[PDB]
Coordinates of C-alpha atoms in Angstrom, one line a residue:
Chain A
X19 CA 12.6 -9.1 11.7
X20 CA 12.0 -10.1 8.1
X21 CA 14.0 -7.3 6.6
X22 CA 17.1 -5.2 7.3
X23 CA 15.4 -1.8 7.5
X24 CA 16.2 0.5 10.4
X25 CA 12.5 1.0 11.1
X26 CA 10.1 -1.9 10.5
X27 CA 6.3 -1.7 10.3
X28 CA 5.3 -4.8 12.4
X29 CA 1.8 -6.2 12.2
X30 CA 0.2 -4.0 14.9
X31 CA 0.7 -0.8 12.9
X32 CA -1.0 -2.3 9.8
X33 CA -3.9 -3.7 11.7
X34 CA -4.3 -0.4 13.5
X35 CA -4.6 1.4 10.2
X36 CA -7.1 -1.2 9.0
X37 CA -9.3 -0.7 12.1
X38 CA -9.0 3.0 11.9
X39 CA -10.2 3.1 8.2
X40 CA -12.8 0.4 8.6
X41 CA -15.7 2.5 10.1
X42 CA -16.1 4.6 7.0
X43 CA -16.0 1.6 4.7
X44 CA -18.6 -0.2 6.8
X45 CA -20.9 2.9 6.4
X46 CA -20.3 2.9 2.7
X47 CA -21.1 -0.8 2.1
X48 CA -24.7 -0.1 3.4
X49 CA -25.5 2.0 0.4
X50 CA -24.1 -0.6 -2.1
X51 CA -26.2 -3.3 -0.4
Chain B
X52 CA -29.3 26.4 0.6
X53 CA -28.7 25.7 -3.1
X54 CA -27.2 22.3 -2.2
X55 CA -30.2 21.8 0.1
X56 CA -32.6 22.4 -2.7
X57 CA -30.7 20.0 -5.0
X58 CA -30.1 17.1 -2.6
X59 CA -33.5 17.4 -0.9
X60 CA -32.3 17.9 2.6
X61 CA -32.8 20.7 5.1
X62 CA -36.0 22.6 4.4
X63 CA -36.4 21.0 1.0
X64 CA -37.7 17.9 2.8
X65 CA -41.5 17.4 2.8
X66 CA -43.3 17.5 6.1
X67 CA -44.0 14.1 7.8
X68 CA -47.5 12.8 8.6
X69 CA -48.3 9.2 9.6
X70 CA -51.1 8.6 7.1
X71 CA -49.8 10.5 4.1
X72 CA -47.0 10.4 1.5
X73 CA -43.5 11.8 1.5
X74 CA -42.6 11.9 -2.2
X75 CA -40.8 14.9 -3.8
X76 CA -39.8 14.8 -7.5
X77 CA -36.4 16.4 -8.3
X78 CA -36.6 19.3 -10.7
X79 CA -33.3 21.1 -10.0
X80 CA -31.3 17.8 -10.1
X81 CA -32.8 16.9 -13.5
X82 CA -32.2 20.4 -15.0
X83 CA -28.6 20.2 -13.9
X84 CA -28.3 16.6 -15.0
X85 CA -28.5 17.4 -18.7
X86 CA -26.5 20.6 -18.3
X87 CA -23.5 18.7 -16.8
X88 CA -22.8 16.3 -19.6
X89 CA -23.8 19.0 -22.1
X90 CA -20.9 21.1 -20.9
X91 CA -18.2 18.6 -20.1
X92 CA -17.9 17.0 -23.5
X93 CA -16.0 19.7 -25.5
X94 CA -13.1 19.4 -23.0
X95 CA -12.9 15.6 -23.6
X96 CA -13.2 15.4 -27.4
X97 CA -9.5 15.1 -28.4
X98 CA -6.4 13.7 -27.0
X99 CA -4.7 17.1 -26.8
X100 CA -6.3 19.6 -24.4
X101 CA -4.4 22.8 -25.0
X102 CA -3.7 24.6 -28.3
Chain C
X25 CA -40.0 26.5 11.4
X26 CA -36.7 28.1 12.2
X27 CA -33.3 28.4 10.6
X28 CA -31.0 25.7 12.0
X29 CA -27.3 26.5 11.5
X30 CA -26.5 22.8 10.6
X31 CA -23.2 22.8 12.5
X32 CA -23.7 20.0 15.1
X33 CA -21.9 21.2 18.2
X34 CA -19.9 18.1 19.3
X35 CA -17.5 17.2 22.0
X36 CA -14.1 15.7 21.0
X37 CA -12.5 12.6 22.3
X38 CA -10.7 12.7 25.7
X39 CA -7.1 11.8 25.6
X40 CA -5.6 8.5 27.0
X41 CA -2.2 8.3 28.6
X42 CA -1.7 4.8 30.1
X43 CA -2.7 2.8 27.0
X44 CA 0.1 4.0 24.6
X45 CA 2.5 2.9 27.4
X46 CA 1.4 -0.7 27.4
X47 CA 2.8 -3.1 24.9
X48 CA 0.5 -5.8 23.5
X49 CA 1.3 -9.5 23.6
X50 CA -0.8 -11.6 21.2
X51 CA -2.7 -14.7 22.3
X52 CA -2.5 -17.4 19.6
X53 CA -5.8 -19.1 18.8
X54 CA -6.6 -22.7 19.9
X55 CA -4.5 -22.4 23.0
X56 CA -6.9 -21.7 25.9
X57 CA -7.1 -18.4 27.6
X58 CA -3.9 -18.1 29.8
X59 CA -0.3 -17.0 29.4
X60 CA 2.6 -18.1 31.5
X61 CA 6.3 -17.2 31.8
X62 CA 9.2 -18.4 33.9
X63 CA 11.3 -16.2 36.1
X64 CA 14.8 -17.2 37.2
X65 CA 15.9 -15.8 40.6
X66 CA 19.6 -15.0 41.2
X67 CA 21.8 -17.2 43.3
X68 CA 22.1 -14.9 46.3
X69 CA 18.5 -13.7 46.9
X70 CA 16.1 -14.8 49.7
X71 CA 13.6 -16.1 47.1
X72 CA 16.1 -19.0 46.4
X73 CA 14.6 -21.4 49.0
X74 CA 15.9 -24.8 48.0
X75 CA 17.5 -27.9 49.6
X76 CA 20.9 -28.5 48.0
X77 CA 23.0 -27.1 50.9
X78 CA 26.4 -28.3 52.1
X79 CA 28.3 -26.0 54.3
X80 CA 32.1 -25.6 54.3
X81 CA 32.3 -28.0 57.3
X82 CA 30.9 -30.8 55.2
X83 CA 27.4 -31.1 56.8
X84 CA 24.0 -30.5 55.3
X85 CA 22.5 -27.1 55.8
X86 CA 19.0 -25.6 55.3
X87 CA 20.0 -22.6 53.2
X88 CA 21.0 -23.5 49.6
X89 CA 22.1 -19.9 48.8
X90 CA 25.4 -18.8 50.4
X91 CA 23.8 -15.8 52.1
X92 CA 20.6 -13.8 51.3
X93 CA 20.2 -10.2 50.3
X94 CA 21.5 -9.4 53.9
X95 CA 24.4 -6.9 54.1
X96 CA 25.5 -7.5 57.7
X97 CA 29.3 -7.8 57.7
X98 CA 29.2 -10.4 60.5
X99 CA 26.6 -12.6 58.7
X100 CA 28.7 -12.4 55.5
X101 CA 31.8 -13.4 57.5
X102 CA 30.0 -16.4 59.0
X103 CA 28.6 -17.5 55.7
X104 CA 31.6 -17.1 53.3
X105 CA 32.5 -20.0 51.0
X106 CA 35.9 -21.1 52.1
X107 CA 38.1 -24.0 50.9
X108 CA 40.9 -26.1 52.3
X109 CA 44.0 -27.8 51.0
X110 CA 42.3 -31.2 50.4
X111 CA 38.9 -29.8 49.5
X112 CA 36.2 -32.0 48.2
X113 CA 32.4 -32.0 48.6
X114 CA 32.3 -28.8 50.7
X115 CA 30.2 -26.0 49.1
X116 CA 27.0 -26.6 47.2
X117 CA 24.4 -24.2 45.8
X118 CA 20.8 -24.4 44.5
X119 CA 18.6 -22.6 42.1
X120 CA 14.8 -22.0 41.6
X121 CA 12.5 -20.6 39.0
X122 CA 9.1 -18.9 39.4
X123 CA 6.1 -18.8 37.0
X124 CA 3.7 -16.0 36.4
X125 CA 0.4 -16.0 34.6
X126 CA -2.5 -13.8 33.3
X127 CA -5.9 -14.4 31.7
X128 CA -8.4 -12.8 29.4
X129 CA -12.0 -11.5 29.8
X130 CA -14.8 -10.4 27.5
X131 CA -16.6 -7.0 27.3
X132 CA -19.2 -5.5 24.9
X133 CA -22.3 -3.4 24.5
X134 CA -24.9 -2.5 21.8
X135 CA -27.7 0.0 21.1
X136 CA -31.0 0.0 19.1
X137 CA -32.6 2.4 16.6
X138 CA -35.7 2.5 14.4
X139 CA -36.4 3.2 10.7
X140 CA -38.8 6.0 11.5
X141 CA -36.3 7.7 13.6
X142 CA -33.4 7.4 11.2
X143 CA -35.2 9.0 8.3
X144 CA -37.9 11.4 9.5
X145 CA -35.3 13.0 11.7
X146 CA -34.6 16.6 11.0
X147 CA -30.8 16.3 11.4
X148 CA -29.2 14.3 8.6
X149 CA -26.2 12.2 9.3
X150 CA -27.5 11.1 12.7
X151 CA -26.1 7.5 12.6
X152 CA -22.6 8.9 11.9
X153 CA -22.9 10.8 15.2
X154 CA -24.2 7.7 17.1
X155 CA -21.3 5.6 15.7
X156 CA -18.9 8.4 16.9
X157 CA -20.1 8.3 20.5
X158 CA -20.2 4.5 20.4
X159 CA -16.5 4.4 19.6
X160 CA -15.6 7.2 22.1
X161 CA -17.3 5.3 24.9
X162 CA -15.5 2.1 23.9
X163 CA -12.1 3.8 24.1
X164 CA -12.9 5.5 27.4
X165 CA -13.9 2.2 29.0
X166 CA -10.8 0.4 27.7
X167 CA -8.6 3.1 29.3
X168 CA -10.6 3.0 32.6
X169 CA -10.2 -0.8 32.9
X170 CA -6.4 -0.7 32.2
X171 CA -5.9 2.1 34.7
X172 CA -7.9 0.2 37.4
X173 CA -5.8 -3.0 36.9
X174 CA -2.5 -1.1 37.1
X175 CA -3.7 0.7 40.3
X176 CA -4.8 -2.7 41.8
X177 CA -1.5 -4.5 41.0
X178 CA 0.9 -1.9 42.4
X179 CA 3.9 -3.3 44.2
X180 CA 5.3 -0.5 46.4
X181 CA 2.8 1.6 48.4
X182 CA 3.6 4.7 50.5
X183 CA 0.8 6.1 52.7
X184 CA 1.2 9.8 53.2
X185 CA 1.6 11.2 56.7
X186 CA 1.3 8.7 59.5
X187 CA -1.4 6.4 58.2
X188 CA -1.1 2.7 57.8
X189 CA -4.1 1.6 55.7
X190 CA -6.8 3.3 53.7
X191 CA -9.0 3.5 56.8
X192 CA -6.2 5.3 58.7
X193 CA -6.0 7.9 56.0
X194 CA -7.4 11.1 57.6
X195 CA -7.3 14.9 57.2
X196 CA -7.7 15.7 60.9
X197 CA -5.0 15.3 63.6
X198 CA -1.5 16.1 64.6
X199 CA -0.3 15.0 61.2
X200 CA -2.7 15.1 58.2
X201 CA -2.1 12.6 55.5
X202 CA -0.9 14.8 52.7
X203 CA 2.1 14.7 50.4
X204 CA 5.4 16.1 51.6
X205 CA 8.9 16.5 50.2
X206 CA 10.2 13.6 52.3
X207 CA 7.7 11.2 50.8
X208 CA 8.9 11.9 47.3
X209 CA 12.5 11.7 48.3
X210 CA 11.8 8.3 50.0
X211 CA 10.0 7.1 46.9
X212 CA 13.0 8.0 44.8
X213 CA 15.2 6.1 47.2
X214 CA 13.0 2.9 47.0
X215 CA 12.8 3.0 43.3
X216 CA 16.5 3.4 42.9
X217 CA 17.0 0.4 45.3
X218 CA 14.6 -1.6 43.1
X219 CA 17.0 -1.1 40.1
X220 CA 14.2 0.5 38.1
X221 CA 15.7 2.1 35.0
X222 CA 15.4 5.9 34.6
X223 CA 13.3 7.5 31.9
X224 CA 14.3 11.1 31.4
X225 CA 17.7 12.8 31.6
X226 CA 19.2 15.8 33.4
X227 CA 18.4 19.2 32.0
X228 CA 21.4 21.6 31.9
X229 CA 20.9 25.3 31.7
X230 CA 20.3 27.6 28.8
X231 CA 21.9 31.0 28.1
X232 CA 18.6 33.0 28.5
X233 CA 17.8 34.9 31.7
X234 CA 15.6 33.3 34.4
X235 CA 16.0 29.8 33.0
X236 CA 16.6 27.2 35.8
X237 CA 18.3 23.9 35.7
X238 CA 16.2 20.8 36.4
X239 CA 17.3 17.3 37.4
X240 CA 14.5 14.8 37.1
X241 CA 14.7 11.2 35.9
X242 CA 11.2 9.7 36.4
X243 CA 7.7 10.4 35.1
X244 CA 4.9 10.6 37.6
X245 CA 1.1 10.7 36.8
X246 CA -1.2 12.6 39.1
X247 CA -4.8 13.8 38.9
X248 CA -6.1 17.4 38.6
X249 CA -7.2 17.6 42.2
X250 CA -3.7 17.3 43.6
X251 CA -2.1 20.0 41.4
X252 CA -2.7 22.9 43.8
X253 CA -1.2 20.9 46.7
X254 CA 1.8 20.1 44.5
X255 CA 2.1 23.8 43.7
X256 CA 2.0 24.9 47.3
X257 CA 4.5 22.4 48.5
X258 CA 7.7 23.7 50.0
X259 CA 11.1 21.9 50.3
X260 CA 13.1 21.2 53.4
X261 CA 14.4 24.7 53.9
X262 CA 11.1 26.4 53.3
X263 CA 11.6 27.5 49.7
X264 CA 9.3 26.8 46.7
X265 CA 9.7 23.3 45.3
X266 CA 7.4 23.2 42.2
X267 CA 9.4 24.5 39.3
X268 CA 7.1 25.3 36.4
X269 CA 7.7 24.3 32.8
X270 CA 8.0 28.0 32.3
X271 CA 11.7 28.1 33.3
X272 CA 13.1 25.0 31.6
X273 CA 10.8 25.2 28.5
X274 CA 14.0 26.2 26.7
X275 CA 16.7 23.6 26.4
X276 CA 14.3 20.8 27.0
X277 CA 11.4 18.8 25.4
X278 CA 8.1 19.3 27.2
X279 CA 6.0 16.2 27.3
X280 CA 2.2 16.1 26.7
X281 CA 0.1 17.2 29.7
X282 CA 3.1 18.3 31.8
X283 CA 2.4 20.9 34.5
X284 CA 5.9 21.1 36.0
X285 CA 8.8 19.4 37.7
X286 CA 9.5 18.6 41.4
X287 CA 12.6 17.0 42.9
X288 CA 13.3 14.0 40.6
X289 CA 9.9 13.6 39.2
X290 CA 8.4 15.2 36.0
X291 CA 4.8 15.6 37.0
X292 CA 2.4 14.6 34.2
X293 CA -1.2 15.7 34.8
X294 CA -3.7 13.0 33.6
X295 CA -7.3 14.2 32.9
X296 CA -9.2 10.9 33.6
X297 CA -7.5 9.7 36.7
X298 CA -9.3 7.4 39.1
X299 CA -9.5 7.7 42.9
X300 CA -11.0 5.6 45.7
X301 CA -13.9 7.6 47.2
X302 CA -15.1 7.4 50.8
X303 CA -12.2 5.3 52.0
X304 CA -10.8 6.8 55.2
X305 CA -11.6 8.1 58.6
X306 CA -15.0 9.6 59.2
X307 CA -15.0 13.3 58.5
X308 CA -16.1 15.7 61.3
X309 CA -16.8 19.4 61.6
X310 CA -13.1 20.1 61.9
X311 CA -12.5 19.4 58.2
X312 CA -9.8 21.9 57.2
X313 CA -11.1 21.8 53.6
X314 CA -10.1 18.5 52.1
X315 CA -12.6 16.6 49.9
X316 CA -15.1 14.2 51.5
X317 CA -17.8 11.9 50.1
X318 CA -20.9 10.2 51.4
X319 CA -20.8 6.6 52.5
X320 CA -23.9 5.0 54.1
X321 CA -24.9 8.4 55.4
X322 CA -21.5 9.1 57.1
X323 CA -18.8 11.1 55.5
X324 CA -15.3 9.8 54.7
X325 CA -12.1 11.1 53.1
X326 CA -10.9 10.5 49.6
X327 CA -7.7 8.7 48.6
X328 CA -5.8 9.7 45.4
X329 CA -3.4 7.6 43.3
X330 CA -0.2 9.5 42.5
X331 CA 1.3 6.6 40.4
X332 CA 4.6 6.0 38.6
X333 CA 5.2 3.2 36.1
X334 CA 8.6 1.7 35.5
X335 CA 9.8 0.1 32.3
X336 CA 9.1 -3.6 31.5
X337 CA 6.6 -3.7 34.4
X338 CA 3.7 -5.2 32.4
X339 CA 2.3 -6.2 29.0
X340 CA -1.3 -6.1 28.0
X341 CA -2.7 -9.3 26.5
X342 CA -4.6 -9.0 23.3
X343 CA -6.7 -11.3 21.2
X344 CA -7.1 -10.7 17.4
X345 CA -10.1 -12.8 16.4
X346 CA -10.7 -13.2 12.7
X347 CA -7.8 -11.7 10.7
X348 CA -9.1 -8.2 9.9
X349 CA -9.9 -6.8 13.3
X350 CA -7.3 -5.9 15.9
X351 CA -9.8 -5.7 18.7
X352 CA -13.2 -3.9 18.5
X353 CA -15.2 -6.1 16.1
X354 CA -18.2 -4.0 15.0
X355 CA -21.5 -5.1 13.5
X356 CA -24.3 -3.0 12.1
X357 CA -27.6 -4.2 10.6
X358 CA -30.0 -1.7 9.1
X359 CA -33.7 -1.9 10.0
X360 CA -34.9 -3.5 6.7
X361 CA -37.7 -5.9 6.2
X362 CA -35.6 -9.0 6.7
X363 CA -34.1 -7.4 9.8
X364 CA -37.3 -7.2 11.8
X365 CA -38.0 -9.6 14.6
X366 CA -39.6 -12.6 13.0
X367 CA -42.9 -12.1 14.9
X368 CA -43.1 -8.5 13.8
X369 CA -43.7 -7.3 10.2
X370 CA -42.9 -3.9 8.8
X371 CA -39.2 -4.2 9.2
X372 CA -37.9 -1.9 12.0
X373 CA -35.4 -1.8 14.9
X374 CA -31.9 -2.4 13.7
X375 CA -28.9 -2.2 16.0
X376 CA -25.1 -2.0 16.3
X377 CA -22.8 -3.8 18.7
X378 CA -19.1 -4.0 19.5
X379 CA -17.1 -6.5 21.7
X380 CA -13.5 -7.0 22.6
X381 CA -11.1 -9.2 24.7
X382 CA -8.8 -7.7 27.3
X383 CA -6.3 -9.1 29.8
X384 CA -3.1 -8.1 31.5
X385 CA 0.1 -9.8 32.6
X386 CA 2.3 -8.4 35.3
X387 CA 5.9 -9.4 34.5
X388 CA 7.5 -7.6 37.5
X389 CA 5.3 -5.9 40.1
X390 CA 8.3 -4.4 42.1
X391 CA 8.7 -1.4 39.7
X392 CA 5.2 0.0 40.0
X393 CA 5.0 2.5 42.8
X394 CA 2.1 4.4 44.4
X395 CA 1.6 7.1 47.0
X396 CA -1.8 7.5 48.5
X397 CA -2.8 10.9 49.7
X398 CA -5.8 13.2 50.4
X399 CA -6.7 16.0 48.0
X400 CA -7.9 19.5 48.9
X401 CA -11.0 21.2 47.6
Chain D
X256 CA -11.1 12.6 -3.2
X257 CA -8.1 11.4 -5.2
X258 CA -7.0 7.8 -5.3
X259 CA -3.4 8.9 -5.9
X260 CA -3.4 10.9 -2.6
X261 CA -4.3 7.8 -0.6
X262 CA -1.7 6.5 1.9
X263 CA -2.7 2.8 1.9
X264 CA -5.0 0.2 0.4
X265 CA -5.8 -3.3 1.8
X266 CA -7.2 -6.2 -0.3
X267 CA -8.1 -9.7 0.7
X268 CA -8.1 -12.7 -1.6
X269 CA -8.2 -16.5 -1.5
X270 CA -5.1 -18.5 -2.1
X271 CA -3.8 -22.0 -1.7
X272 CA -0.4 -23.3 -0.5
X273 CA 0.8 -24.2 -4.0
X274 CA 0.4 -20.6 -5.1
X275 CA 2.7 -19.5 -2.2
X276 CA 5.2 -22.2 -3.0
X277 CA 5.3 -21.0 -6.6
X278 CA 7.6 -18.2 -5.5
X279 CA 9.4 -19.6 -2.5
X280 CA 12.0 -16.9 -1.8
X281 CA 9.4 -14.1 -1.6
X282 CA 7.6 -15.5 1.5
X283 CA 8.9 -16.4 4.9
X284 CA 7.5 -18.3 8.0
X285 CA 5.2 -20.7 6.0
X286 CA 5.5 -23.4 8.6
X287 CA 4.2 -21.4 11.5
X288 CA 0.8 -20.7 9.9
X289 CA -2.1 -23.0 10.7
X290 CA -4.3 -23.4 7.6
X291 CA -7.6 -24.6 9.2
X292 CA -8.1 -21.5 11.3
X293 CA -7.7 -19.1 8.3
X294 CA -10.2 -20.4 5.8
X295 CA -13.0 -18.8 3.7
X296 CA -15.7 -20.1 6.0
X297 CA -14.0 -19.1 9.2
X298 CA -13.5 -15.5 8.2
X299 CA -17.0 -13.9 7.9
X300 CA -16.2 -10.4 6.7
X301 CA -14.6 -11.8 3.5
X302 CA -17.4 -11.9 0.9
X303 CA -17.3 -14.6 -1.7
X304 CA -19.4 -16.9 -3.9
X305 CA -17.8 -20.1 -2.4
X306 CA -20.4 -22.3 -0.8
Chain E
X358 CA 5.3 2.4 -11.7
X359 CA 5.6 3.0 -8.0
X360 CA 1.8 3.6 -7.3
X361 CA -0.9 1.6 -5.7
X362 CA -1.9 -1.1 -8.3
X363 CA -5.6 -0.4 -8.4
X364 CA -7.7 1.6 -10.8
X365 CA -10.9 3.3 -9.6
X366 CA -13.8 4.2 -11.9
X367 CA -17.1 6.1 -11.0
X368 CA -20.4 5.7 -12.9
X369 CA -21.9 9.0 -11.9
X370 CA -19.2 11.2 -10.2
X371 CA -19.9 12.9 -7.0
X372 CA -17.9 16.1 -6.8
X373 CA -14.8 15.8 -4.6
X374 CA -15.3 12.1 -3.7
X375 CA -13.8 8.8 -4.7
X376 CA -17.0 6.8 -5.2
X377 CA -19.8 7.1 -7.6
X378 CA -23.5 6.8 -7.6
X379 CA -25.7 4.4 -9.7
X380 CA -29.1 5.4 -10.9
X381 CA -31.0 3.5 -8.2
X382 CA -30.8 6.6 -6.0
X383 CA -33.2 8.4 -8.4
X384 CA -35.5 5.4 -9.1
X385 CA -36.3 3.6 -5.9
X386 CA -39.4 5.6 -5.0
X387 CA -40.8 5.4 -8.6
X388 CA -40.3 1.6 -8.5
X389 CA -42.3 1.4 -5.3
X390 CA -45.2 3.5 -6.5
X391 CA -45.4 1.7 -9.8
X392 CA -45.4 -1.7 -8.1
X393 CA -48.2 -0.5 -5.8
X394 CA -50.4 0.6 -8.8
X395 CA -49.9 -2.7 -10.6
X396 CA -50.8 -4.7 -7.5
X397 CA -53.9 -2.7 -7.1
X398 CA -55.0 -3.5 -10.7
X399 CA -54.4 -7.2 -10.2
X400 CA -56.4 -7.1 -7.0
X401 CA -59.4 -5.6 -8.9
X402 CA -59.3 -8.3 -11.5
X403 CA -58.5 -11.2 -9.3
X404 CA -60.9 -10.7 -6.3
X405 CA -64.1 -10.1 -8.4
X406 CA -66.3 -13.1 -9.2
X407 CA -66.1 -14.1 -12.9

């Protein structure tokens, strides 16, 4: 643990959020390209 | 249907043939394109919005 | 032409129950593709097979440990560690450690589409749909593989009825191989002896009429085919056993996909639950009504999992390649001109592909338990 | 449709070890990281003008 | 401030959406047809014997 919080995020939560949001962003970048 | 006419989807799309074109100029979009920025500006002219 | 409603009747994503259970252990990069851990056995168990034994007499002995897991009073009395007045170099002990390991494999699949198809198509947003079913299939396959591995690495197996192997499982005879109250009670006894920690707590009564008290401390996952049999089951004295979530819905928290509670187990119905098909005695015309399947032209009975997972049983290895993707790396390349196969002009035929790494490590296989049984029609 | 309603945002940038050592107390576990594996050339999704 | 430290700006707003649209959406087809016409004229002049 890096911090003293009762509930800590950990890396899996953040990467899960990233992979959940990624499919829409991948679709969007096609139009910009 | 009105959004279909503006965005050229649904029935607004031209029929497809292998040896012919599929170009459709956008009349409704253009007509609305000047109207938008014609109307928006009075609300953004001054720092204070309500009198 | 007709008036399409533009609503796109779609089917949602099937739930997954085993995957949220599993914890994920990362595999650091540049380290191969295997993970290992030690296990330290106690002093007094039979797995402590060493050679450092000196008995109380003063002579060398085969067994390093004082006495195994045996509970015979006579054996304990014979193998007690005793000391004398002038004691020296009499009793010696030895220890061992065991290593366990697990590895990683690779999966993936793609699909292809064309420029003509993507645009001239009547329905707009087609690729969004195709991406949606791609992801749904990927998640379903992940769940199936994990469930298969857990079913295959089960530690304690109880064949229902009087059968001894999958071949001996049958639905015809003096004793058909179905679930009974005694099997569940015995499974509870074994799991308690294995020191498996409990999961749930006892439910005391509420103050509203018809509510019934429930004592259950384990969570059991069964398929949809066995639910009628579990409902019709009767306890030792002939009464009804299956107590629905109806009665203890008050004064209790009802878990997802829970049909009811029996004995000490809170039954949790799982939609996509696997079963070996055509693994049993050859079915005849005397079939009372249990499910059968075709195998090389001859019928056979079907075996069903009825699995329970204990805590700390296993951890699922994971491999985060790159630094942006926690599994499921996705690529899409549109059918532009530069995207055509080099021998083919008029750019066409793009594609989309996903791949992932999966592996499992079984820390302790004694806690997983499994009851094989036949399911009715 | 509103940036303020968003729950999260993730941004990737290039950095060297001296930049992290500029503010030592902010960061932890610097020693465990391996620098060769995480580099602009190794991570392909990151888009940059670096050769 | 307590907010996400990013500022987002659209060129042509799309109603009820974060991102914006450039004017290439409206101009791609015209670009293609104009290029085709110019290539045709250059073909006429170039292929003929002078």
